[PDB]
Design a protein around this ligand. Structure first.
Ligand code: GDP
Ligand code: CAC
Ligand code: CAC
Ligand code: ALF
Ligand code: CA
Length: 318
């Protein structure tokens, strides 16, 4: 019936494309077997890049292996890397990664992932390597949802829900991609801005001196107060709440906000972060921004949250 133009915005790796995958699962026909098979190479690539990053970090962070034998494994894994066909995972490689993942040194390095760049799904894939390499492996929906591919251009997702015809557009979030955003700012019905809660102790890939959350805060400030959005519903998704729940117990929020006095807890820290974003809206007197703590990889959560977003879009049309 009514056409709704939705824009998914946010900094690099915040979770935009994952929400898009969820729309296909929830509001379209989901993934076909053939579509799933196409993700094997992507998954094998992600898994390889993750362990490679952790291995590299061993040297970078000067962390020794638990068992010296792992050092040999690490080196031969490195040679295999530039030798194997991309997207593949030979048994010789899997056996090595398997042994490395179990190493205490590797684990200690894994825990220090915020000090270097590591795929969000590194732990997910590596801890489940046996299943992934089992001959005949076919990706599950969660495997597909956890996959990583940096996108840059604009992607349109169209679906019907509650009699509304959605035209959802997502774009890359890196600094280099933002210049072109303005071309998509016309006649927008709703903007979903995605910010990763767990980014508070992370630095940008574009500038290792810039805190990821400070970057998203700056970007949100620009977005929520933009001229083109005065009459558009804005919703904030504070994504990666699952990663955040674990992180908050180890990393102090003060890393990001030196002024924070509250307890480093999920509820407190989460609410404080939420306030930091929402306080940037200088049009609050005329427009309220709704926010949701989300886990883009969780279908039921995304299903729930998107249902609530459509309700807001519908209400705003009253
Ligand atoms: N654990 C977890 N991983 C997430 C979540 N949202 C996204 N990811 C993962 O983080 C990575 C980057 O997400 P992606 O959607 O590609 O980011 P985009 O660059 O903003 O499109 C992917 O590997 C996702 O599976 C989340 O809520 N929890
Ligand atoms: C149809 As597939 C989740 O493999
Ligand atoms: C570059 As637009 C999908 O905003
Ligand atoms: F910000 Al991206 F793929 F890294 F949309
Ligand atoms: Ca993307």
């Amino acid at each position: 019936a009514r056409t709704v133009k939705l824009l998914l915005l946010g900094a690099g790796e915040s979770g935009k494309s994952t929400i898009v995958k969820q729309m296909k699962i929830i509001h379209q026909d989901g993934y076909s077997l053939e579509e799933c098979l196409e993700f094997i190479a992507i998954i094998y690539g992600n898994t390889l890049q993750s362990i490679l990053a952790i291995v590299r970090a061993m040297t970078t962070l000067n962390i020794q292996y638990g068992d010296s034998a792992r050092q040999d494994d690490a080196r031969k894994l490195m040679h295999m890397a530039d030798t194997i066909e991309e997207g593949t995972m030979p048994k010789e490689m899997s056996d090595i990664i398997q042994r490395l993942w179990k190493d205490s040194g590797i684990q200690a390095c894994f825990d220090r992932a915020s000090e270097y760049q590591l795929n969000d799904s590194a732990g997910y894939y590596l801890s489940d390597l046996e299943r992934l390499v089992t001959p005949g492996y076919v990706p599950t929906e969660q495997d597909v949802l956890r996959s990583r591919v940096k996108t840059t251009g604009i992607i349109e997702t169209q679906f019907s829900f509650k009699d509304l015809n959605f035209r959802m557009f997502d774009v890359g979030g890196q600094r280099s991609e933002r210049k072109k955003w303005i071309h998509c700012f016309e006649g927008v019905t709703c903007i979903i801005f995605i910010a990763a809660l767990s980014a508070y102790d992370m630095v940008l890939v574009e500038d290792d001196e810039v805190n990821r959350m400070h970057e998203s805060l700056h970007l949100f400030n620009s977005i929520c107060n933009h001229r083109y959005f005065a009459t558009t519903s804005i919703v904030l998704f504070l994504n990666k709440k699952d990663v955040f729940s674990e992180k908050i117990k180890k990393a102090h929020l003060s890393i990001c906000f030196p002024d924070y006095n509250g307890p480093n807890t999920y509820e407190d820290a989460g609410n404080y972060i939420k306030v930091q974003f929402l306080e940037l809206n200088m049009r609050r007197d005329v427009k309220e921004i709704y926010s949701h703590m989300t886990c883009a990889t969780d279908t039921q959560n995304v299903k729930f949250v998107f249902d609530a977003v459509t309700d807001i879009i519908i209400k705003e049309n009253l």
